[PDB]
Each structure stands twice: as structure tokens, then as C-alpha cells.
UniProtKB/Swiss-Prot annotation, chain A:
Gene3D superfamilies (alphabetical): Ribosomal Protein L25, Chain P (2.40.240.10)
Gene name for this UniProt entry: rplY
Oligomeric form and interacting partners: Part of the 50S ribosomal subunit; part of the 5S rRNA/L5/L18/L25 subcomplex. Contacts the 5S rRNA.
Keywords: Ribonucleoprotein, Ribosomal protein, RNA-binding, rRNA-binding
A single BP term in Gene Ontology: ribosomal large subunit assembly
GO CC, any one term: cytoplasm
The name this protein goes by in its record: Large ribosomal subunit protein bL25
Protein family (similarity comment): Belongs to the bacterial ribosomal protein bL25 family.
The protein's role, per its UniProt record: This is one of the proteins that binds to the 5S RNA in the ribosome where it forms part of the central protuberance. Binds to the 5S rRNA independently of L5 and L18. Not required for binding of the 5S rRNA/L5/L18 subcomplex to 23S rRNA.
Entry's Gene Ontology molecular function annotations: 5S rRNA binding; structural constituent of ribosome
From Swiss-Prot, chain B:
Name of the protein in its database record: Large ribosomal subunit protein uL18
Domain notes: The basic N-terminus is not necessary for binding to 5S rRNA. It is however required for cooperative binding of L5 and L18 to 5S rRNA as well as for binding of the 5S rRNA/L5/L18 complex to the 23S rRNA.
Region: Required for binding of the 5S rRNA/L5/L18 complex to the 23S rRNA, residue numbers: 1-16
Molecular function in Gene Ontology: 5S rRNA binding; structural constituent of ribosome
Keyword Cytoplasm: no
Gene: rplR
Pfam families the record matches: Ribosomal_L18p
HAMAP family: Ribosomal_uL18_B
InterPro entries named in the record: Ribosomal_uL18_bac-type, Ribosomal_uL18_bac/euk
Gene3D superfamilies: 3.30.420.100
UniProt PTM: The protein has been shown to contain a phosphoserine, which was required for the protein to bind to 5S rRNA. However, the presence of this phosphoserine is controversial, and it has not been seen by mass spectrometry.
Biological process, per Gene Ontology: cytoplasmic translation
One GO cellular component, as annotated: cytosol
Swiss-Prot record, chain D:
Source species: Escherichia coli (strain K12)
GO cellular component: cytoplasm; cytosolic large ribosomal subunit
Region feature Disordered, mapped onto this chain: 1-14
Pfam families from the UniProt entry: Ribosomal_L27
Assembly behavior: Part of the 50S ribosomal subunit. Cross-links to the 23S rRNA. Cross-links to the A and P site tRNAs.
GO molecular function, one term: ribosome binding
NCBIfam families according to UniProt: L27
Assigned keywords, A-Z: Ribonucleoprotein, Ribosomal protein, RNA-binding, rRNA-binding, tRNA-binding
Name under which the protein is recorded: Large ribosomal subunit protein bL27
Curated annotation (Swiss-Prot), chain E:
Record carries keyword rRNA-binding: yes
Name of the protein: Large ribosomal subunit protein uL5
Protein family (similarity comment): Belongs to the universal ribosomal protein uL5 family.
Subunit structure: Part of the 50S ribosomal subunit; part of the 5S rRNA/L5/L18/L25 subcomplex. Contacts the 5S rRNA; cross-links to the P site tRNA. Forms a bridge to the 30S subunit in the 70S ribosome, contacting protein S13 and S19.
Species of provenance: Escherichia coli (strain K12)
Gene name in the database record: rplE
HAMAP family assigned: Ribosomal_uL5_B
Keyword rRNA-binding: yes
An MF annotation (GO) of this entry: tRNA binding
Single Gene Ontology BP annotation: ribosomal large subunit assembly
Modified residues (N6-acetyllysine): K2
Entry function: This is one of the proteins that bind and probably mediate the attachment of the 5S RNA into the large ribosomal subunit, where it forms part of the central protuberance. Its 5S rRNA binding is significantly enhanced in the presence of L18.
Note: Identified as a multicopy suppressor of the slow growth phenotype of an rsgA (yjeQ) deletion mutant.
Pfam families linked to this entry: Ribosomal_L5 (PF00281), Ribosomal_L5_C (PF00673)
NCBIfam families: PRK00010.1
Length: 94, 116, 136, 79, 178
RNA sequence: UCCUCCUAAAGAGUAACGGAGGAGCACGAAGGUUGGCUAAUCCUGGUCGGACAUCAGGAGGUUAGUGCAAUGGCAUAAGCC
RNA sequence: GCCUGGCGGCCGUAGCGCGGUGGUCCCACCUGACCCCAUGCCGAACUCAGAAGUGAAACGCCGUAGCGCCGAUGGUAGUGUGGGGUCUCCCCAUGCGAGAGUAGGGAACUGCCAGGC
């Protein structure tokens, strides 16, 4: 069980995705739940310090974004080409 | 699939007719029936036809798969062709032989009027 | 000793390395090595590195190898001038880049590639080291 | 070694490309050694000994997307 | 030439009074024998079959024809268009006509005569009635010395299983073994 | 000297004793044309049968073949009857 | 309105597998053949004279998603144009960018005509 603070991600593309990763952030997404896809910004090393536990993937977690809070489940990951660091991650509505 | 071999022979013909466009006469038969239809110069619809389904033939013929029933359709489609004034009509045999009931239909269509 | 299957054609072209290509997910085991750099790897180097591990691991495992020689190289006499031409095949080589895992392990708990890799890294290019299994 | 030759001078390129003038006959596609990858459709045909889909009437090319999976035909437009 | 009359009266058809079949299209039917006679090493004789050209039509109710090979070089010698056999195939009335001599009078030579083994059974109940080599039937000029060749016969059925194809062995009698 | 696939750069000819090969002929038929046909390979079983032998069944198929080379295609068959 | 067939327009979200259902119009099997036509033998194939028997098979209709098929959104590889860093690679600014995978879809669409109930 976890609760994390997220922010709606409003600027997308390669150089912006690399910019986040230099400025303590990284891209992610929320989809499913019979609702439209949402793009989000997360803390780069602080979520990497969190996801290395089974209870991040075996059970739901809360995301706090857009002035509400919702439960999701972790769906997918992209790792760095030669490092365990987070490049991009997927979530699905729970 | 010996049924599909007749469809292959029809693909051969359909491709060969595709470069012609225009008004087309298609003949089709089965062990109890025979019919002939005139397809429009846009290919999208029929104009006129003749078929062993009409009680004008089907009540007078003792079997609709007969030679004289094929001639009855030939003599009807030629008569309806004269009503709609069709010329330069390309013939199509639906993958069948021309010999037999399609020839016996055509032989009588050129007896009810112009060739055909 | 490692001597790959005779090439369909008598000679090959060496080719350029892009110096990245992800391949970090272990599929012949659960753990492996860190590459994090780029260069050329030879058949004698991977057999000398296999010898270094064979001497420390005895017969445990085995260990699986995801790098194999890709090209034979043409070699000729040193005195031949510049111009004509390419010699016969001599040594076999491959290319390495940061995303490589090189070697894959699972059946060798804590006695290989868990505390150090220095003894096998001393036989190889690009100052390599071990990696821990990726589980999340 | 050597003597692989390949020889010299051969082309048959770029003649089946983009917007046409619609007032003389055109090759439509001159792709080498064509036997079934393309073929012809609609009002036009091409049966030349050099596998050219040359249309026998004056018109423009349709650049048609119809045809089964990876088999697409040389056809002339209606205007 | 009487089986044609009886095969239309009750043989594997009176079944339809006690079992759930509304037509003969769900019951066992027999209508074919794809006959052949091989030549073997005849290429090293090339003179006997040059005069015995109707010697298969002497037992089958159809027109004789020599079959030409589909092979042009072989480890036993063959040549392009060489005659490799004769068929004289039985269907319908000529098949029922031909069947009236099988097991009934084909007894001049035997090798088990109690049912051998159910080869080529196809899981349907396809029955063996071959003779390995011709045994000669009474017709005309059959009492003399004359040579004989290889002859094998399988009767194949439209049945779906040997559980239901065996309704033929419940209407006729012949020696059978699996 | 001629000829294919590739190098040759998502516009074209094209380099270096560049990469895999060929051509100086063949077939009056292996050409024209109407209608058809559909591999191969393997399994099953059938006297004379060393050993591949027959005719029929089953699996199965841009995998057979194409005068010759390399390449692209293939039943609307350009493959064979 | 639903059904059966055809000309098709279209031919990888009509495909593969799995479970039901139909003989009425239709079709397939099927009745018979030295008759028209036919087997390099065989009514198998293709005919011709057709309804005695079915819906076995093939065919049509319908359900069922494990999948071919369709497939977001984001990211990644890639990159045009400027520029950074002892530099055949890394890093950035600005403008573009897949394929594959994931969520998810999905057991065909549609115009004309004849007949059926």
C-alpha cells in the first residue's frame, strides 16, 4: 500500500521526456476504468526508491492528482538502456 | 474442391471482363434451374432478366432443369433484350462450359431474334 | 577452443557499432553482468574470461553466454604493401555496447557475479562488472 | 578473387511515380520482372514482353489502395 | 448378376426399420473397386504383355487400357511413357456384378480363409477380399494352362465407424478377423 | 563485351583487382492457341521383390516446377495435360 | 421484417478453434442413363432425362473471444535544423518520429434484384 503525489503532464515529446529526467521528474500514464487516458509527472528517484517492493505491483496504490485521489494498479515499465532507472511507467484504474 | 474450380474459371472470366466495363449478360445454371441477367453499364445493378422461377415457365415445364426450359429462358431474355434495346453486350458464363444448356439457351435466343 | 562454423561466403565485412542497444533482461537465467560501455570483443578474450570463471566456479551452473563471435577477420603477411589485398580468415570477433548483459546466470548463487567480478573483468575490454537480478 | 563483374548500365526506374498529365499513354509502373505483385485493374491492361503495365488509353493514375493485402493494381482514373 | 436386385431390397437397408437413419446417406453403402494390375519387371520381357493386352478385361466388365508411367528414370529401369499397369475400374452395377464372384467361388487357392487381418480398414470397416494372385473363373477357354498375375481387393464403405460399417457382415457371410 | 541480386546514399547513372554468379548458346520444339490440371515430400497397404516399384486413402502446400545463371513472381498460373 | 440465392462493391477486425440449428423457397448429396455429352479404364469428371430418399457431408444461420485481425494513449529506437563536451560517441535547444508491446476492441460490411414465409 502506497500513496503518491502526481501532477498532470501537459508537455510531451523526446526532449521534454529527457528534461524531466534531468530535473528530478519522469513521465507516466493512467488508462482504463472505462475512462480516457491521462498523462502524469512523477518524482524520478523517489518512485524508483518505492517500486522496488512487491506491494507496489501485487496490490493497488493511490495517486493524488487533478484535485482528487484515485486508486490504480501498476501495469508496465520502461527501464534505462543500461541502468535500472525509470524512463516511463503505465498504470490502470482499479 | 471441385465447386471452387468453377469459381476459378469465373475469376478468369471476371478479370477478363473488367477491362470491357459496359452492358453485360450473365448466364447461370443449376441441376434444376437456369437463369440469365443483364447487368447495367455501371456494374452496380441488374436491368432485366429471365429465370425458371417465373410461373410463366415453371407451370408449363414438367422439369425446370430440362433443355426446353433453358430454351424458354433464352427465348424470354432475348424478348426482354429487344424491349430495352441492348447492343454491344458482352457474354459471361459464370465459370461453366458454354456447351450444353448454355449453348441450348443461346441457340434459341438467336432464334427469337438478333444474335446473341 | 572456440572455432565458429565456416561462413557461407569466404570473407565478411567488420561493421560499425551504435554503442547502446538495450538487452538487459535476463532470459537464460535471472542475473548477469553490467556492460555500460562500447568496443570490440574477440574469441580469445571470451575463452580467456571463460577460463578465469571455469577456474573459480569449477563445474557449478553452467553459465550461459549471450555473446558469440559474429565475424571472421581477414589477415595477411605484414610485408605486402598498401593496396591488394585481403588475406585469408584468421581470428573471430563481435561488437559490445552498454545495454549488453554478456553472460547469464541462475544456478550459481553467491559464488559468481554477486560481490565482485574483478578476476574475469581482468580478461576483458571495457572494465566490466556484475549485476543483481531485476525483480520489479 | 574478384571477377564478380555485375557489368554496366541497367535502370528501368521512377517512371511509375506521381501525378500524370492525362493526355498520352503511360507506363504506370516499370518495376522489373513483374509477374503477380502488381498486375492491372479497371479499364486498362498491359501484357508487354518487358512486364510493363502500360495503359492503352489516355488518362491519369489512380494510385489505388484496394486489392488483397500486399497486392495492389495499376489502374487509370475517371475524369 | 443378381446382387443389384437384393442390394436394393433389404441388404444394409432393412436396418432403417430399427435404427435412426432417415436415408441411405447415414447407412453403409458400397459402390466402388479401384482395380489395378501391375507389370513388375516386365521391362526385362517386353513381349508377353505385348499380346496379353485384354487379360484384365477378362475379369472386369469395362474397356481395357494400358496406364503410362509418371516416372522417367528409376532404380529398376523405366523409360518415359512406359506402360506401368492396367486399371479397368469397377463402379455401380459392374461393381455389384463383380462382387458376386468374391468369396462365393474365389476358392481355387487359399492362404488363411478364416479372415487373415483387417488391413486397410480405415477405422470404418473396409473389408479385404483379395486373392494375392488370380485364381481363374469359369467363362470360356479356362480349363487349359495359362499364366496368372497379382490381384488384391478392398471393399471400402461410406460408414463413419466400424461399429456401424459391420452391418454388412450382418447381411452377408464371409470369413473375418481383425 | 553482355546479364541478375547487393554495395549505391527511402531522386538517377555510379567507385575501390568491391560481394554471390553467369552469357558467346538452347528449343522447329521447349513456339502459337482452346479447354483443363495442380504440386513436392512423407505415412498406409497390395505375388513373383535384393532396392526405390502399382493403384487408392491420409497429412500437406506461394515449400513442386520454371532450357541454362542469379533474382523477383506464381492456380487470373508465366508450372504441365 | 426475417430468410435462401445471385451480380457484385469490397476480400486479414468475413480468419483458426469450440457448441447449437435448418430442408420452406434454394442448394448439395441424390434417382436413372448404350437416349445429348463422356471416360486416355470408370456416369469419378462433365453431361442429359429428373424429385424416390435426406440434410449425413458440403452449405447457410446462430452462439462462444483462447487467438490471426483491429488497436488507443504515453514512452523508446530514429531524426531535420542549431550548438554544446579531448568527440567516429555523449549532451542540449528547437521541429518531427516508428515498429513492437499495453488498455481495449472483435465472431464481417453494404447497394441492387428474384423468390420464400
Amino acid at each position: 500500500m502506497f500513496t503518491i503525489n502526481a501532477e498532470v503532464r501537459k508537455e510531451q515529446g523526446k526532449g521534454a521526456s529527457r528534461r524531466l529526467r534531468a530535473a528530478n521528474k519522469f513521465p507516466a500514464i493512467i488508462y482504463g476504468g472505462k475512462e480516457a487516458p491521462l498523462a502524469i509527472e512523477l518524482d524520478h528517484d523517489k518512485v524508483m526508491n518505492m517500486q522496488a517492493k512487491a506491494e507496489f505491483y501485487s496490490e493497488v496504490l493511490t495517486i493524488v492528482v487533478d484535485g482528487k485521489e484515485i486508486k490504480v494498479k501498476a501495469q508496465d515499465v520502461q527501464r534505462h538502456p543500461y541502468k535500472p532507472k525509470l524512463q516511463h511507467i503505465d498504470f490502470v484504474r482499479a | 474442391d471441385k465447386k471452387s474450380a468453377r469459381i476459378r474459371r469465373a475469376t478468369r472470366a471476371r478479370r477478363k471482363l473488367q477491362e470491357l466495363g459496359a452492358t453485360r449478360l450473365v448466364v447461370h445454371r443449376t441441376p434444376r434451374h437456369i437463369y440469365a441477367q443483364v447487368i447495367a453499364p455501371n456494374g452496380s445493378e441488374v436491368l432485366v432478366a429471365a429465370s425458371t422461377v417465373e410461373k410463366a415457365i415453371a407451370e408449363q415445364l414438367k422439369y425446370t432443369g430440362n433443355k426446353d426450359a433453358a430454351a424458354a429462358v433464352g427465348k424470354a431474355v432475348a424478348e426482354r433484350a429487344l424491349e430495352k434495346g441492348i447492343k454491344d453486350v458482352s457474354f459471361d458464363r459464370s465459370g461453366f462450359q458454354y456447351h450444353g444448356r448454355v449453348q441450348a439457351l443461346a441457340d434459341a435466343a438467336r432464334e427469337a431474334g438478333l444474335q446473341f | 577452443m572456440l572455432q565458429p562454423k565456416r561462413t557461407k561466403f569466404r570473407k565478411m565485412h567488420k561493421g560499425r557499432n551504435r554503442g547502446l542497444a538495450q538487452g538487459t533482461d535476463v532470459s537464460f537465467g535471472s542475473f548477469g553482468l553490467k556492460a555500460v560501455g562500447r568496443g570490440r570483443l574477440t574469441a580469445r578474450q571470451i575463452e580467456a574470461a571463460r577460463r578465469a570463471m571455469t577456474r573459480a566456479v569449477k563445474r557449478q551452473g553452467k553459465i550461459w553466454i549471450r555473446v558469440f563471435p559474429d565475424k571472421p577477420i581477414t589477415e595477411k603477411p605484414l610485408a605486402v604493401r598498401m593496396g591488394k589485398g585481403k588475406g585469408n580468415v584468421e581470428y573471430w570477433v563481435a561488437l559490445i555496447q552498454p545495454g549488453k548483459v554478456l553472460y547469464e546466470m541462475d544456478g550459481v548463487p553467491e559464488e559468481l557475479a554477486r560481490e565482485a567480478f574483478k578476476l574475469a573483468a581482468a580478461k576483458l575490454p571495457i572494465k566490466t562488472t556484475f549485476v543483481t537480478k531485476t525483480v520489479m | 578473387g574478384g571477377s564478380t563483374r555485375n557489368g554496366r548500365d541497367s535502370e528501368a526506374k521512377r517512371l511509375g511515380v506521381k501525378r500524370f498529365g492525362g493526355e498520352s499513354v503511360l507506363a504506370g509502373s516499370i518495376i522489373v520482372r513483374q509477374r503477380g505483385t502488381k498486375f492491372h485493374a479497371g479499364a486498362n491492361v498491359g501484357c508487354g514482353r518487358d512486364h510493363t503495365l502500360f495503359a492503352k488509353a489516355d488518362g491519369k493514375v489512380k494510385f489505388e489502395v484496394k486489392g488483397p493485402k500486399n497486392r495492389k493494381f495499376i489502374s487509370i482514373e475517371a475524369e | 448378376a443378381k446382387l443389384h436386385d437384393y442390394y436394393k431390397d433389404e441388404v444394409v437397408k432393412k436396418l432403417m426399420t430399427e435404427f435412426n437413419y432417415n436415408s441411405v446417406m447415414q447407412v453403409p453403402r458400397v459402390e466402388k473397386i479401384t482395380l489395378n494390375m501391375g507389370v513388375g519387371e516386365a521391362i526385362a520381357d517386353k513381349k508377353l504383355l505385348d499380346n496379353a493386352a485384354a487379360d484384365l478385361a477378362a475379369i472386369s466388365g469395362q474397356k481395357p487400357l494400358i496406364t503410362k508411367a509418371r516416372k522417367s528414370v528409376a532404380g529398376f529401369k523405366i523409360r518415359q511413357g512406359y506402360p506401368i499397369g492396367c486399371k479397368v475400374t469397377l463402379r455401380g452395377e459392374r461393381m455389384w456384378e463383380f462382387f458376386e464372384r468374391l468369396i462365393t467361388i474365389a476358392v481355387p487357392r487359399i492362404r488363411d480363409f478364416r479372415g487373415l487381418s483387417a488391413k486397410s480398414f480405415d477405422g470404418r470397416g473396409n473389408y479385404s477380399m483379395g486373392v494375392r494372385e488370380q485364381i481363374i473363373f469359369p467363362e470360356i477357354d479356362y480349363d487349359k494352362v495359362d499364366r496368372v498375375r497379382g490381384l488384391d481387393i478392398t471393399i471400402t464403405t461410406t460408414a463413419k465407424s466400424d461399429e456401424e460399417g459391420r452391418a454388412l457382415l450382418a447381411a452377408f457371410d464371409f470369413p473375418f478377423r481383425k
